[PDB]
Amino acid sequence: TAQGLAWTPVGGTLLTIEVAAVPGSGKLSLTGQLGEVMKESAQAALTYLRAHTQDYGLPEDFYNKVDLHVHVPDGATPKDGPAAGITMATAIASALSRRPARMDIAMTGEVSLRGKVMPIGGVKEKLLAAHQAGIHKIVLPKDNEAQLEELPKEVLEGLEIKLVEDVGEVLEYLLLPEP
Amino acid sequence: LERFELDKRVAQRVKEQMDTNQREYYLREQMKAIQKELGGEDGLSDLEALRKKIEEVGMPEAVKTKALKELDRLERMQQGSPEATVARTYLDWLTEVPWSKADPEVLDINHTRQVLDEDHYGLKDVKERILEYLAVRQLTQGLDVRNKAPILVLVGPPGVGKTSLGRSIARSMNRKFHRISLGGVRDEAEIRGHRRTYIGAMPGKLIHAMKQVGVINPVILLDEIDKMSSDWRGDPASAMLEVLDPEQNNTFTDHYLDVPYDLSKVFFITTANTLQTIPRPLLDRMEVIEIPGYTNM
Amino acid sequence: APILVLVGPPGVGKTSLGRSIARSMNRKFHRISLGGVRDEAEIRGHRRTYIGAMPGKLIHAMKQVGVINPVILLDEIDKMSSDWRGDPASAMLEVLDPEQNNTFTDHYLDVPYDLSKVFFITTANTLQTIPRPLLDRMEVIEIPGYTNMEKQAIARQYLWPKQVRESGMEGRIEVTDAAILRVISEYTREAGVRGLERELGKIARKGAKFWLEGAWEGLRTIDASDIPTYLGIPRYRPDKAETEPQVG
Amino acid sequence: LERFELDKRVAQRVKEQMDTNQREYYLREQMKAIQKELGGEDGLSDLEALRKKIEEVGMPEAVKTKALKELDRLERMQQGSPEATVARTYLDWLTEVPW
Amino acid sequence: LRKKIEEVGMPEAVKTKALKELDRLERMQQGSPEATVARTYLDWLTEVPW
Amino acid sequence: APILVLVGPPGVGKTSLGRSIARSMNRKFHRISLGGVRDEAEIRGHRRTY
Amino acid sequence: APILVLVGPPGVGKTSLGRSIARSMNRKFHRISLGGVRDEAEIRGHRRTYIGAMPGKLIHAMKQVGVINPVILLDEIDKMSSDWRGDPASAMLEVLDPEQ
Numbered sequence A: 001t002a003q004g005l006a007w008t009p010v011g012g013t014l015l016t017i018e019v020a021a022v023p024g025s026g027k028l029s030l031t032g033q034l035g036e037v038m039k040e041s042a043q044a045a046l047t048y049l050r051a052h053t054q055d056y057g058l059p060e061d062f063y064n065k066v067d068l069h070v071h072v073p074d075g076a077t078p079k080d081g082p083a084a085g086i087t088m089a090t091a092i093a094s095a096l097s098r099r100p101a102r103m104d105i106a107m108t109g110e111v112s113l114r115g116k117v118m119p120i121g122g123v124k125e126k127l128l129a130a131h132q133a134g135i136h137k138i139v140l141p142k143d144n145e146a147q148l149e150e151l152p153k154e155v156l157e158g159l160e161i162k163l164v165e166d167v168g169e170v171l172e173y174l175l176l177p178e179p
Numbered sequence B: 001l002e003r004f005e006l007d008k009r010v011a012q013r014v015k016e017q018m019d020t021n022q023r024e025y026y027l028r029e030q031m032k033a034i035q036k037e038l039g040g041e042d043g044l045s046d047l048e049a050l051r052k053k054i055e056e057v058g059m060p061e062a063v064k065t066k067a068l069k070e071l072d073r074l075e076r077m078q079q080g081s082p083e084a085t086v087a088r089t090y091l092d093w094l095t096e097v098p099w100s101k102a103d104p105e106v107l108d109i110n111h112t113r114q115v116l117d118e119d120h121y122g123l124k125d126v127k128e129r130i131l132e133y134l135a136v137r138q139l140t141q142g143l144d145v146r147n148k149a150p151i152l153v154l155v156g157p158p159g160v161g162k163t164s165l166g167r168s169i170a171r172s173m174n175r176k177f178h179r180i181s182l183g184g185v186r187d188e189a190e191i192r193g194h195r196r197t198y199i200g201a202m203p204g205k206l207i208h209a210m211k212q213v214g215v216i217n218p219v220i221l222l223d224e225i226d227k228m229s230s231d232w233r234g235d236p237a238s239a240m241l242e243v244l245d246p247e248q249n250n251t252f253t254d255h256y257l258d259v260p261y262d263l264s265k266v267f268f269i270t271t272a273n274t275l276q277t278i279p280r281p282l283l284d285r286m287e288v289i290e291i292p293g294y295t296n297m
Numbered sequence C: 001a002p003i004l005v006l007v008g009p010p011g012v013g014k015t016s017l018g019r020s021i022a023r024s025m026n027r028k029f030h031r032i033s034l035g036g037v038r039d040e041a042e043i044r045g046h047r048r049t050y051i052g053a054m055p056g057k058l059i060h061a062m063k064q065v066g067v068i069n070p071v072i073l074l075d076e077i078d079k080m081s082s083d084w085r086g087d088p089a090s091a092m093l094e095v096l097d098p099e100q101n102n103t104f105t106d107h108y109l110d111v112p113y114d115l116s117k118v119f120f121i122t123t124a125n126t127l128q129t130i131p132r133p134l135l136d137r138m139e140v141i142e143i144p145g146y147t148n149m150e151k152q153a154i155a156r157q158y159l160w161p162k163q164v165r166e167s168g169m170e171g172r173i174e175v176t177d178a179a180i181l182r183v184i185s186e187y188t189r190e191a192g193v194r195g196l197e198r199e200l201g202k203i204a205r206k207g208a209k210f211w212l213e214g215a216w217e218g219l220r221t222i223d224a225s226d227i228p229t230y231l232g233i234p235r236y237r238p239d240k241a242e243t244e245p246q247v248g
Numbered sequence D: 001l002e003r004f005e006l007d008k009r010v011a012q013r014v015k016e017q018m019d020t021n022q023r024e025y026y027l028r029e030q031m032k033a034i035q036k037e038l039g040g041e042d043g044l045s046d047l048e049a050l051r052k053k054i055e056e057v058g059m060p061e062a063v064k065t066k067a068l069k070e071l072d073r074l075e076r077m078q079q080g081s082p083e084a085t086v087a088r089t090y091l092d093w094l095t096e097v098p099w
Numbered sequence E: 001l002r003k004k005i006e007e008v009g010m011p012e013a014v015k016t017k018a019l020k021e022l023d024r025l026e027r028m029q030q031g032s033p034e035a036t037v038a039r040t041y042l043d044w045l046t047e048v049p050w
Numbered sequence F: 001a002p003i004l005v006l007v008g009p010p011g012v013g014k015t016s017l018g019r020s021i022a023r024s025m026n027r028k029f030h031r032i033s034l035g036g037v038r039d040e041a042e043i044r045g046h047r048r049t050y
Numbered sequence G: 001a002p003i004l005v006l007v008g009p010p011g012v013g014k015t016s017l018g019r020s021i022a023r024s025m026n027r028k029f030h031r032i033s034l035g036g037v038r039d040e041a042e043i044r045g046h047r048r049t050y051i052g053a054m055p056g057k058l059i060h061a062m063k064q065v066g067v068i069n070p071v072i073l074l075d076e077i078d079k080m081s082s083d084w085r086g087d088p089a090s091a092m093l094e095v096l097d098p099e100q
């Protein structure tokens, strides 16, 4: 389980599932009703099995060979951003890690091949979705340092912003044990 | 005999059904005998009282001539005559929109700053593009209150007290706030109406709120315009983009407005709260302000 | 005689080009977007049978202009579709070519209208989706985006004077080459000029807000320095010369 | 007593309502009665012309039988009825395709 | 509408078209789409350049 | 017996051959494209009832 | 306790005796070959990937019968291939055990 948060156009939610661990062959499949740009991003995510097998600490056999049973809660998954398809990759990255997530400690950002978190859009909307739910611990990319103060002074009074610089550093800010 | 008793059964069904229809018919005509109770008073207010209001309204000689023109034709036996309907339906907002009164224009954008500081706390994003809106609202292509431009439609969740928003800006602009029903209603009678040759065609709710005050420049909140659609095909696109164009709004006709109304100093606001349910020709004369909402605290 | 097609992304001045040509011809001008059309039921009329039965978009287009000889711009004939029964591609086929449309009629109408004299353009955006019998007898012209130099030329010479003239900023706000250099090379990244109008408007009406809170300077210079003051932050890099020299 | 008189004035008002309704409705059937005398008559000349076209176009007998039975369905209002304008289109399709 | 069609130059067949549909007016003016939609038709015909 | 199918490149003379035969046989040439058709109704006949 | 595997001569003896017992127990006999069945998406359901996701053939065996307790004969259990996601055998072991 990973807080692959994606802002819905209507309201605001914290996108996440409960995850199995049933590996074996590269066919994690979902009828997520995804968009066409998210369709081609998923077609990229096919070979991102060979890309995420090397960008993080994940083993080499991830190049082609992992299943699991994934059920994304919002069947109306298109939420006006590329925070739909990387969710399964992040969930498997936590799954092949085999160690769980951190209680009431979410994450967000944008993932890259080189291993850096690009700042996630809508810091106000992601922090409304984070706080209106009730989570008080926030993992934002480092370049949102200037966009933390661009928000009004009533959203972040119970919010702690644990700034992140790498996608590995997301893993320490999201994976339950210390590493 | 089974067929015969079936005949008796179906005869009972048809008798109860016709009794039901008759009873509903009597029920509606009571409503019409309970509503027509104040019909005479409407005619009285539509008579000498109407003329008095027209005098105080001081409608432009052209508009006054129109009112007098139809009114002189409507001059006759008030009873057993529809002259009262055409003497009120079209001359009620004409008698309720005096041109000797209007909302005080706040040319001071700084004043707006202060009054929007206490909407909730200023909101720091609403008031900035609102204040763009006012400083431009003074300073336009004609350096006056003419658009040729957007009036700044909202986009957001509906949860805020948007009524209080319209009131605090109608305070920061000394405007007479109104509300109508325009979004969610699916018939061109609250939005356009149709030409005054049938009822159900009606003054729009904009015309009704225009009747709600005497000031010639009220603020008619086009209520939840995001859910706008109408069962009457033949788009109000003509209506909405004709009223959004001041060159077409000083000449604002509709299906209902068979005379170009002098909607010239009239101010509107536009309100969207959903980003997909939009008929296309409102792509223009619209622009969006950030409106921050509320966290759980 | 083949009809012009002006394929290319939105916001590259396709319909304003038609405005120019109308000026050049001293006719009127009009557009009707066929983007998201899925039936013959609205291009030709719906057969008139109730309130809520409508003539065609060409009939409307004819109705707005008050001239029998305008220059119609059939915008977005590439987003023409048929996902439900009814293939109106042939309807536009009988519209375009000059001989057969001489007595054109919609299903709502019965009048054979004359359309041989009416000059046409026909805007699309990509011809790979036009029906192939449509694609015969036209001219395929891609219209590109514009270089950074060309885009600042659009702004400085043709757009930014419109931004300052809609919002009363005429002769009270000066905006430099450095500022609009920042506008394109630092802030705005898109095919057409479409969003440029919007963030430029943000700059513009913020500046009008600044001028009406006191005209201490009658000339308020918005250069590349105060660009983040009037608008928000630079959300993309100024130059692509500054990322990193990458390995592979 | 004032409730009594209010009910009486309501009774007179609904009496007037039903008087008005029967009068205006009687006008509705008078306009219909004066209408079908000529008002509906002139529109039938269209149907006569279309039928003459069907009769004059040489057709096989199955064609003509289907045409006449579809035509008898057309002997109704279509002008606000989308269920018989399709009949007019049908009969005009038949008479204007060669045989 | 008769005046407007009279002034807006019509083809004589289209002129008689409008006159016939005008006779489809003059019968009702209120309620069902019976001359109301016909009024929409006539308004469409009038306000097209000729 | 067969019905004379034509196959070949997109721009090569096909409809030219058709019109050539048509004039040759004193025939009215015509063309109906069938690109993208997937309904039987849109080319045979759609349900008449509505 | 066993469920009486039938092995020996191909096409000979096995189904005959099974139908004989189902006649004796008066349970609605059925018979399903699994030779071409080598995917667990055919044993249990197919994971939904398009329009036309489909159940296991064992439900389809239950679909051809109107009871939840007949005698059913399965066929070709002695081979196995992991040509798809996992094996079809594991889902069949799920079918065998009573709490599964």
Ligand SMILES: Nc1ncnc2c1ncn2[C@@H]1O[C@H](COP(=O)(O)OP(=O)(O)O)[C@@H](O)[C@H]1O
Pocket (backbone or CB within 6 Å): F009, F010, F011, F012, F013, F014, F015, F016, F017
């Ligand atoms: N070799 C040719 N001879 C005559 N006409 C040609 C030739 N090649 C192309 N054309 C022209 O190409 C047009 C397209 O029709 P045609 O070439 O017959 O089939 P297609 O539409 O498959 O290309 C015709 O109008 C014709 O005038």
Ligand SMILES: Nc1ncnc2c1ncn2[C@@H]1O[C@H](COP(=O)(O)OP(=O)(O)O)[C@@H](O)[C@H]1O
Pocket (backbone or CB within 6 Å): G009, G010, G011, G012, G013, G014, G015, G016
């Ligand atoms: N002892 C027996 N008496 C009668 N028939 C037999 C006997 N043993 C085998 N058979 C025949 O063997 C066949 C059973 O084999 P079959 O149902 O074809 O496949 P499998 O044995 O692989 O299930 C029956 O058709 C039956 O006629």
